[PDB]
Amino acid sequence: ETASWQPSASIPNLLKRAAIMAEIRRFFADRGVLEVETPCMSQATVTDIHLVPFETRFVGPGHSQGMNLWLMTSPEYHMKRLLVAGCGPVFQLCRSFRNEEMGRYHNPEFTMLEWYRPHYDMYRLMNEVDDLLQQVLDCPAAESLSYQQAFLRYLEIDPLSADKTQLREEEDRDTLLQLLFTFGVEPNIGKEKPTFVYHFPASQASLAQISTEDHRVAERFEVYYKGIELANGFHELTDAREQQQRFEQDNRKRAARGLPQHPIDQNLIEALKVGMPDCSGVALGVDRLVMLALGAETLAEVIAFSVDRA
Amino acid sequence: ASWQPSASIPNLLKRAAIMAEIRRFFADRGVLEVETPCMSQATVTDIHLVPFETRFVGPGHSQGMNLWLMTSPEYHMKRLLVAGCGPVFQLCRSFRNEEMGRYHNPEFTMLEWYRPHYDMYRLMNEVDDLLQQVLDCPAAESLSYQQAFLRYLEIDPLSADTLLQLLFTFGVEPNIGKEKPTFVYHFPASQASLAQISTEDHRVAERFEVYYKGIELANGFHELTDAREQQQRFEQDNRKRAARGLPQHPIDQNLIEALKVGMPDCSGVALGVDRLVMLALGAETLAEVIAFSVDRA
Numbered sequence A: 001e002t003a004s005w006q007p008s009a010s011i012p013n014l015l016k017r018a019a020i021m022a023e024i025r026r027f028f029a030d031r032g033v034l035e036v037e038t039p040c041m042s043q044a045t046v047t048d049i050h051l052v053p054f055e056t057r058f059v060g061p062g063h064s065q066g067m068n069l070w071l072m073t074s075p076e077y078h079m080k081r082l083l084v085a086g087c088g089p090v091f092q093l094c095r096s097f098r099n100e101e102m103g104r105y106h107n108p109e110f111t112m113l114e115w116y117r118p119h120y121d122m123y124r125l126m127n128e129v130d131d132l133l134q135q136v137l138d139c140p141a142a143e144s145l146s147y148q149q150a151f152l153r154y155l156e157i158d159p160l161s162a163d164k165t166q167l168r169e170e171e172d173r174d175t176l177l178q179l180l181f182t183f184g185v186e187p188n189i190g191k192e193k194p195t196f197v198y199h200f201p202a203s204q205a206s207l208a209q210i211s212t213e214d215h216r217v218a219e220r221f222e223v224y225y226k227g228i229e230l231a232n233g234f235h236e237l238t239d240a241r242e243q244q245q246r247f248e249q250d251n252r253k254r255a256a257r258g259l260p261q262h263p264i265d266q267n268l269i270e271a272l273k274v275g276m277p278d279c280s281g282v283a284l285g286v287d288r289l290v291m292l293a294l295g296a297e298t299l300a301e302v303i304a305f306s307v308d309r310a
Numbered sequence B: 001a002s003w004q005p006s007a008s009i010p011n012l013l014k015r016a017a018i019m020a021e022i023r024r025f026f027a028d029r030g031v032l033e034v035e036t037p038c039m040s041q042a043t044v045t046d047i048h049l050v051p052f053e054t055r056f057v058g059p060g061h062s063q064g065m066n067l068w069l070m071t072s073p074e075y076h077m078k079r080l081l082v083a084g085c086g087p088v089f090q091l092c093r094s095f096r097n098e099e100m101g102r103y104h105n106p107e108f109t110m111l112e113w114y115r116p117h118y119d120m121y122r123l124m125n126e127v128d129d130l131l132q133q134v135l136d137c138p139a140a141e142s143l144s145y146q147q148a149f150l151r152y153l154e155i156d157p158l159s160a161d162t163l164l165q166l167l168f169t170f171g172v173e174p175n176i177g178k179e180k181p182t183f184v185y186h187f188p189a190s191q192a193s194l195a196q197i198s199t200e201d202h203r204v205a206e207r208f209e210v211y212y213k214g215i216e217l218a219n220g221f222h223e224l225t226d227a228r229e230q231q232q233r234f235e236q237d238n239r240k241r242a243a244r245g246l247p248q249h250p251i252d253q254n255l256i257e258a259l260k261v262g263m264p265d266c267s268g269v270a271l272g273v274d275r276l277v278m279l280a281l282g283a284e285t286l287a288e289v290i291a292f293s294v295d296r297a
Ligand SMILES: NCCCC[C@H](N)C(=O)NS(=O)(=O)OC[C@H]1O[C@@H](n2cnc3c(N)ncnc32)[C@H](O)[C@@H]1O
Pocket: A073, A074, A076, A098, A100, A105, A106, A107, A108, A109, A110, A112, A114, A207, A229, A230, A231, A232, A233, A234, A236, A281, A282, A283, A284, A285, A286, A287, A288, A299
């Protein structure tokens, strides 16, 4: 429609977005959470099987042949390194990068709000996220639903026990579960108020600690509202050995799927060996939250220049 | 060990305070904060810059596309000005493919802002006010490029180019900004960059840089708004690159088309926040004020 040179977001939306950013900063300042800035580029990347990071070449030091750098998909690894270093509760409003096509709710570069809370367990963190959503969105308090309960209610099936065959009614169980969640659960939740889905299957623990009450589940949660996935958080895994092992598992799964394997970030593992204080952390997509807050129809409407015009 | 941050936690705590202080400074003046892309389908032709390059999968149907990391958010901020954003600033992460150094990191934080209807002196006064506040340093001194040469090297630059830059670097920089920041303005028209060339003296451009304690802190211009002249300079840039065996870069058509529509008269300036924080905290290297310098990232 508009000529390419124009921003995809209206001037009024840019002003309203700036107000929301300041509101988010006040929210954390009032709770004593320190703001930090970590790298957008790294010598390492993530093994998470669902992400495709951007790659770029750096001239490197002195007389080097040069070196590959990956753009950061989320500031998590560096923030955990800071936690081990004693930074205390911290948040960050950074630009994050993912090599994936632009969509109504996706841009290859987007703003992430990610923060960590030492001594907070998963529920405690969820309540804080709930507070932030109610404030900037002026929406009602959230509903919380366990992954298992979500499946039973909308698909009349138990994801923690259901048979592979039953699920089909793909030999990889999690892909099957994610398929069912994407088309069978997601479209039905967060309609009247934000929905927190917690206690994902152990296999989808990512960097979250496994539940002490039920080994089949991980202390991970995701927030959905008005059809948009808004956040993803964990009671963080502090065991370096298990973390190293999960990254190895990631690469095995990548390989078996014909996906490139990624180097394991040794800086994250060495930090975890030194010791990360027990904590829970969460990452929320700021553009999506702003889009909902401003009544926008697409992410592009709240981003100065979506990639198609950048 | 390698896992540790390059900046101390206390420095990170003080850096956040300075960032908040910078935001208050602009809020108090009614300057809007904006966030533009870190990646673009175009890049800069500026002969001295080496941008990072990355590949984007793009639309599922396409063959993908090349993207360039932004060396400064100038082009997008200028497009916003044409769209009517008014006075704006940005605290973004900027990228330049250059070796890590005592005063350089391939990714650093830029404080860049634009002031509609401000001539370059009015804008310099504002930069001066910011330095005073953040560094608690004396008000700055201002020297024209000509005056700076005529007194530190007894020679008239406007009547006497890579040479000048070699002279400025060794014959001027070393003795300016010692007791207070030093603004050097009216650089040779030859080094106008995206600045208007002065109509009172065609031998100079309306551009300035500010130095303090031996550190180059900022670079600003009374902005060139003529689309045709800007396009000509970019082509000039690429011919020089070709002459120097450097790659020729695609010119940002969106910037030119926006300038065709009309950008309000304005002045803009880009400042290195990491260098500013380094001075504020009395840190020795940029690495000491950045959570993880590239060697550790
Ligand atoms: N340690 C606890 C936090 C871990 C966060 C984890 N590393 C992570 O990235 N989770 S995420 O779900 O993949 O991303 C968080 C949010 O980022 C937002 N996101 C992700 N990709 C995009 C894109 N491409 N555009 C816009 N927004 C996006 C979205 O709201 C997600 O809920």
